[PDB]
Amino acid sequence: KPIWEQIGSSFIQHYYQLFDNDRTQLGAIYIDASCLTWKGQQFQGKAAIVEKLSSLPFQKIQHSITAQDHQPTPDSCIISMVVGQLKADEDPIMGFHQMFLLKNINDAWVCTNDMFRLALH
Amino acid sequence: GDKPIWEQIGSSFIQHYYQLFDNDRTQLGAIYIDASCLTWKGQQFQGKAAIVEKLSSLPFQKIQHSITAQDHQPTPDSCIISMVVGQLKADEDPIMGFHQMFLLKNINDAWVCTNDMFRLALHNF
């Protein structure tokens, strides 16, 4: 696999492992100026992003990725796009779409931009 | 002052791209540059000439997109990143869900698309 698929695939394995197990620890993949759009509502900066994701109303969540597409940009970033399915607690399975913009800051890949949408029935 | 500039540019880019896509997709070469990158259902196409040939060769005669949702953000290096969720109707095929992402960059006083990723939502049978 090309270098950008290796980085992107590891990033999304780290993100969803953290999301499904301890989502108060999700601050480690974001920077202070990160931006999150969650179902059309924009959450700006690390502190707002971590607060929003830690406060979601489910106890147990599990994601499964159906397809994951990765690309390098001209200015050294990686774009990762995921389609999947998730299950929160006892609610029915829902499809989702998520997109990540990754940037190498201080020798590590972090997420600067994050967009999430549920698929609608 | 109301709508941020990246929402303004993103939204009008989206509208222009899908107008061009649904009416004559051989005119789609104006929004890409030579360093542009397209991933169309998991297959990566590098460069303007290879992107335009792939999009001109799709086997549909009539295509219509309809946007359900469009989300736009500024990136740290001054680019605009957009995420689109919608539905498409090609010919007499069943309506399919899609997702698309566009990364825009201002080159020569014009917003061009450097990175484009498309994927169809499959029906779970």
UniProtKB/Swiss-Prot annotation, chain A:
GO terms for cellular component: cytosol; nuclear inner membrane; nuclear membrane; nuclear outer membrane; nuclear pore central transport channel; nucleoplasm. One of its GO terms (biological process) is positive regulation of protein import into nucleus. Residues 7-118 form the NTF2 domain. Changing M115E: Loss of homodimerization. Decreased interaction with GDP-bound RAN. Decreased interaction with nucleoporins. Decreased localization to the nuclear pore complex. Signal peptide: none annotated. Keywords: Acetylation, Cytoplasm, Membrane, mRNA transport, Nuclear pore complex, Nucleus, Protein transport, Translocation, Transport. Changing D20N: No effect on interaction with GDP-bound RAN. No effect on interaction with nucleoporins. No effect on proteins nuclear import. Changing M99E: Decreased homodimerization. InterPro entries: NTF2, NTF2-like_dom_sf, NTF2_dom, Nuclear_transport_factor_2_euk. It is found in: Cytoplasm, Cytosol; Nucleus outer membrane; Nucleus, Nuclear pore complex; Nucleus inner membrane. The keyword Cytoplasm applies. PROSITE patterns: NTF2_DOMAIN. GO terms for molecular function: identical protein binding; nuclear import signal receptor activity; small GTPase binding; structural constituent of nuclear pore. Gene3D superfamilies: 3.10.450.50. Its main location: cytoplasm. The modification N6-acetyllysine is found at K1. Homodimer. Interacts with RAN (GDP-bound form); the interaction is direct and regulates RAN nuclear import. Interacts with the nucleoporins NUP54, NUP58 and NUP62 (via FG repeats); recruits NUTF2 to the nuclear pore complex a step required for NUTF2-mediated GDP-bound RAN nuclear import. Interacts with CAPG; mediates its nuclear import. Mediates the import of GDP-bound RAN from the cytoplasm into the nucleus which is essential for the function of RAN in cargo receptor-mediated nucleocytoplasmic transport. Thereby, plays indirectly a more general role in cargo receptor-mediated nucleocytoplasmic transport. Interacts with GDP-bound RAN in the cytosol, recruits it to the nuclear pore complex via its interaction with nucleoporins and promotes its nuclear import. PANTHER family: NUCLEAR TRANSPORT FACTOR 2 (PTHR12612). This is Nuclear transport factor 2. It comes from Rattus norvegicus. The lineage of its organism: Eukaryota, Metazoa, Chordata, Craniata, Vertebrata.
From Swiss-Prot, chain B:
Its main location: cytoplasm. Disulfide bonds: none annotated. Keywords: Acetylation, Cytoplasm, Membrane, mRNA transport, Nuclear pore complex, Nucleus, Protein transport, Translocation, Transport. The keyword Protein transport applies. CDD domains: NTF2. Changing D116N: Decreased interaction with GDP-bound RAN. No effect on interaction with nucleoporins. No effect on proteins nuclear import. GO terms for molecular function: identical protein binding; nuclear import signal receptor activity; small GTPase binding; structural constituent of nuclear pore. PROSITE patterns: NTF2_DOMAIN. GO terms for biological process: mRNA transport; negative regulation of vascular endothelial growth factor production; positive regulation of protein import into nucleus; protein export from nucleus; protein import into nucleus; protein localization to nuclear pore. Residues 9-120 form the NTF2 domain. InterPro entries: NTF2, NTF2-like_dom_sf, NTF2_dom, Nuclear_transport_factor_2_euk. SUPFAM superfamilies: NTF2-like. GO terms for cellular component: cytosol; nuclear inner membrane; nuclear membrane; nuclear outer membrane; nuclear pore central transport channel; nucleoplasm. Changing I63Q: No effect on homodimerization. Loss of interaction with GDP-bound RAN. Decreased interaction with nucleoporins and localization to the nuclear pore complex. It is found in: Cytoplasm, Cytosol; Nucleus outer membrane; Nucleus, Nuclear pore complex; Nucleus inner membrane. The modification N6-acetyllysine is found at K3. Homodimer. Interacts with RAN (GDP-bound form); the interaction is direct and regulates RAN nuclear import. Interacts with the nucleoporins NUP54, NUP58 and NUP62 (via FG repeats); recruits NUTF2 to the nuclear pore complex a step required for NUTF2-mediated GDP-bound RAN nuclear import. Interacts with CAPG; mediates its nuclear import. Mediates the import of GDP-bound RAN from the cytoplasm into the nucleus which is essential for the function of RAN in cargo receptor-mediated nucleocytoplasmic transport. Thereby, plays indirectly a more general role in cargo receptor-mediated nucleocytoplasmic transport. Interacts with GDP-bound RAN in the cytosol, recruits it to the nuclear pore complex via its interaction with nucleoporins and promotes its nuclear import. This is Nuclear transport factor 2. It comes from Rattus norvegicus. The gene is Nutf2.
